[PDB]
Structures are given as C-alpha cells and as structure tokens.
Design a protein around this nucleic acid. Sequence first.
RNA 1: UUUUUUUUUUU
Length: 628
Amino acid sequence: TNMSIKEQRESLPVFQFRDQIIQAVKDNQILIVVGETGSGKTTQVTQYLAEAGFTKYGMIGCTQPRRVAAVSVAKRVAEEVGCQLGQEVGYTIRFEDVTSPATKIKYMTDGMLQREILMDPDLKRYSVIMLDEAHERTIATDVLFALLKKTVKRRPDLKVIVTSATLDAEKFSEYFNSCPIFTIPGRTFPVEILYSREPEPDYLEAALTTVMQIHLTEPPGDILVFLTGQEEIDTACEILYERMKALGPSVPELIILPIYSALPSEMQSRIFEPAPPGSRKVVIATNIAETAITIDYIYYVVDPGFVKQNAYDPKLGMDSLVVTPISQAQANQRAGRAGRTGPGKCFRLYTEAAYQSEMLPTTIPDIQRQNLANTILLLKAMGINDLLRFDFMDPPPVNTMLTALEELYALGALDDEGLLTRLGRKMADFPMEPSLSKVLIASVDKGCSDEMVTIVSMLNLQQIFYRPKDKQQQADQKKAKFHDPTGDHLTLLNVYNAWKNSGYSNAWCFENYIQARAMRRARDVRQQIVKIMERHRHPIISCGRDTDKIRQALCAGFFRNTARKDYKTLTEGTPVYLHPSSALFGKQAEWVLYHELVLTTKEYMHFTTAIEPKWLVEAAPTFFKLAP
RNA sequence: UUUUUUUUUUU
C-alpha cells in the first residue's frame, strides 16, 4: 500500500486551501480557479470534491487540452486514490474509453466533452465539470465556455470550475456572470530575465551565440532554446555541433538534442536522459516545450521571441504559417521553464521596451484564427442557429463565420434559411471537417467508399513522410515509389495499402521513411470511420481499378479548393503553387483539386490531385455556371 | 516552381 503518498498530496500548495475550495464550490455554481504552475490543482481538486461526497449523485469530469495529460493525470490520480485505472478514477480519449460503471472521477480531452454534450446537452451523468488548462484557449475549451454557461441555467445542481491564468481571471469572471475568483499559489523558483541592449539582426545566429556564452560563461545547468521550425532546428544543431568541434577537445561536452512533433518517439525520449558527469545538455525545441513536453533539470532558456503561428484568411481559403513575435504570456511561459526544477536564468534576445510595448500581452485565441466550418456544423447539430450572435468569450472574425456558413450551405449541410439538413446532421456524426464527411457520403453513390475511408483516414494525420537532414534524397526516392500519376490523394491510398500488405510492419515504415505513429493513428481512424459508416447503413464498396470514381467523389466536397494551370484558383484566380512534396510536382495537370492551401514561403496547395472540369459541374451543379 | 508551429472528435 502507499508509503509517503499521503505526504506527497499534503506537500502540494493546494492542500493549504483544501477546506476553502470545497466551500467555494458548494457556495458558487460557477467558480474561476487561478492556480500558478506548481499548485497541484489538476490532481487534487477532483479528489477534494469526491472526498466531500460530490460523487454521490453525479460523476466528476475534468477536461484537458491534450490526450497525454488526460491519461497521465488520471494514472497519477488513480494511484493517489489507490484504485485500478478505469475503476473509481478513469479517463476518456478518442479510441480509448478507460471507464467502468464504478468511475466517480473521469479525466477527458475537452474535445470529448464537446462530442458528449451533443448527445447529452445537460451532461446528466456529471455532477461537476472542471475545465483544466483553460488558458491554452483550445477551440473545444472556448466552445465549452459558451455551452456550459447555457447548461448552468438549465441545471442548478451541476457545478462548473474553470481554470485561468492570472491576467485573464477578471475577464473570465465577467464572462461567467461575474462569479468569484479563487487564487492558489504554486511552487516555482525565481528566473533572472536578461534583455538584449541592441536588437539582434539574425535571431538564429543570436540564439546560437547566446548558447555558446552560457555553455562557456555560466555554471552547470541544461539549456532550453525555442526556435520555430524542424528544418531551422535541424540546421541549428549541425551548426552548433560544427562550432563546438572547431573549439578544441579541451572544452566540456555539450549534448545537442532537437525536439519537435515531427521527430520520432525513440529520438524524442533521449531529451529526458540525464547529462553524463561534467556534460551540459542543450535542447533546441519548437513551442512544443512550453506546455506539451516537460524536461527535468532545465535552468537556462534562450528565448529569441519567434513562434510559427496559424492564421486563416477566409476570403482566400488559405492558412498562413508566418514566423511572428511571441506574446508576453508566451515569453513568460518560456522563461518559467528554467525555474520549474530549481532557480534559473532566461536570455530574451530583445529589448525590455520591446517586450513591454512591442509585444501583445496574450496570444490570439485559436477560435479567432482557424477555419470554423467544423465548429459551426457541431453547433448547428446542437440546435443553435443565430451563430453570428452566439455567446463566445472571444468572438471570431465575422467574415470567417460567414464563409464557414456559406461552405456548409454549398455541401448541403444547411438549407437556404441556414437550418441544419438531414445530410448536415449525418455529417456532424463524423469526427472530421465537413468537406471530408461530404466526400465519404458522395463515395457511396460513386462505389468507392472502401478507398475513400482509407484516403480520409490519411488526411487527418501529421508528418506522414519522414525527411531526416542527412538522408533527404534517400527519403524522397522511397516516397516516389508510392506516387500515383493522378496526385497525392491516391498516393495516400498507395501508402496505406503498402503498409497493410507489409503486415503493418514498423520495420517497413523505418526502411521507407514513413512515420509509424501516423500510420497507426490512420488505422484507428479508419476503424472508427467504418463503424460510423455501418451505423448510417452506408455499405463499404471498392471501386477496384476504377479510381476515377474516387476523384469524382472528391469533387463533391472540395470543389471550392480548385485551380487551373497558367496555377490560379478558379474561385478567386489567386496564384497558387504545387508543393515540392507533391506527386504532381514534376508533372502536368491542367485542372487540380487540393485539400488545403497554406502560405509558408509560397501559397502552396497541399495534397493536390488532377481532376476533369466536367466532374466539378457534375458534383456541384449550383456552384458552377457554364459560359463560352 | 524546391518543403508546416501546436493540438482535438463516432453513436
């Protein structure tokens, strides 16, 4: 049984406020909890309420923005409770419902509560909902603010806790009917903040220069540096290696480790391995290392002050990944990573005035800079109509919502009055953007649903093809073996099929430079998608060698994303470019359909496939007029 | 024409 586990729970700062928070949650229906980093609110508050009997008539739900945090928090809470995982304490995430009729405390992804609230608007199974990591501002969390604010009026018994950063506390309060704010101190350590005197013309080189000084002019302690992209991070490690070699073998070893989402898990694990005696560790990271990945024994942070941010342009149907200055909170999250284990220093390569007057206090929330076609279909399915007037804490741009409503109209998900159609309600069952659900349903009439479920499973995935620095040409040679003459959609089909016919081999993934993590998730998606298809009584049909049927069906959902070769978009005529990764790169194709258009260094079409103009007027008869 | 930060979901 537990020996010293009780001491661990009572050692946490939140234990000093135990009695007071239990009182605050019986007093107030909605409550804001600000808990600084070390507080222990995540693991304890759920248990404090269960211990006070809040579990008697209702279950306790706690949302997390990330899957890994739902499982890790649930596992830790379960050991403190002393019960098997999935009994008294459980977690629910996509493809992993680890709960049983005995579960009184349930940790889940925000996304999961979003999806639950569609089938049960009053969330009858739950007595208490806690939204953890509310400061992250994930679209799901922002949606849950609005829905739960309406749910509280419907059910007076149900209690809601919402977490917040200190700066947004009063904002969140006024949103939630000016309910009270409970503050809980953390255990974090001081961090000395060093601003640059004159701004640095090259942030990459300045960051590398700062890393060398810290390694040679500072006491023992590992370094976390934040850069923006995998290619930039990969290049920085080689440059920093070359520079340390150039200095003698007299100088202490500096161990240079990249960290990014694209990186394989085996390579990711080494950043946690401790530094041999007399060595220093420098992790070169994206913003993945702000919240998502936690690295022990970090005492120095290099903050060049740049992140790659998403921004959606609805008039152009284009995402922008631009390197932009980070928010003040982001800089503070980056700084705080050196004070987690013990006291530390953070080297910001910008002026103090630049931080104070040239940096936004908070990062723009996601709901205000992503395509919302998905979110709006879900809210329509929940029976909400005047979405322009919907009660979002931070309302998204009006043009973005209007284009999302126009896209749902064009797919048949809304009628001329903007009410949800029978088709729309069906498309809302599919956990994907409407355009993909549209294509799955078009694929039944075309006789190609078997291929289309594979293709739609591969659209969801991130970093399908692995491109390591030293073996870039070897990777592209192996990728080209799968190229379909028509383009990227049937290449994804080829890749999934070759993996299946390899016996789902990790070795075959490694030898063909393909991320097994991606193929594994696609398979799990394909199984969930097939179950949804059976439920709506849509047969799974193979088109055999007749792959024109797949391309015809794709026209049903992606007609808006189309271009014609000088490429220019048919809808606006804006110039767009084939991505160098595309199976169509070297190749001629007059008419093209693309999954997504993203401005990095160029306006690049993603997953482009060659199509025939007749299919566009076949698939979308009202959205193409003919003319000589 | 030469390469995308981070994350979420069936009934």
